[PDB]
Amino acid sequence: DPARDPQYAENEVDEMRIQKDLELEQYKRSSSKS
């Protein structure tokens, strides 16, 4: 159950969402051949 769906937060989850996406997308774009 990592989803943590039956929970609510505004500032914590929004900022984590934004940061989570920004970092992962940058690492994908690095286009490593590994």
Place this chain on the structure above:
Amino acid sequence: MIQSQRPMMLQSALAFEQIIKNSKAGSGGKSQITWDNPKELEGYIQKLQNAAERLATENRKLRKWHTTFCEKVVVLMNIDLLRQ
């Protein structure tokens, strides 16, 4: 209080509501107090205000803590474990 869902506040707020309801049991008569003699109503209000003061105090503590925990969590998620 529903913004936090902590029973600390939801349960005691019900106790406050009960104090209100206890007075509300005579609402039909309260509707006519001020017109003739406001002192009786002053008593009913003071009772509710004393409860309101207790609940307001708990609300302030709740808001203080809520901000405190929010601020620290939003910092932790920005800390790279490999550096800091």
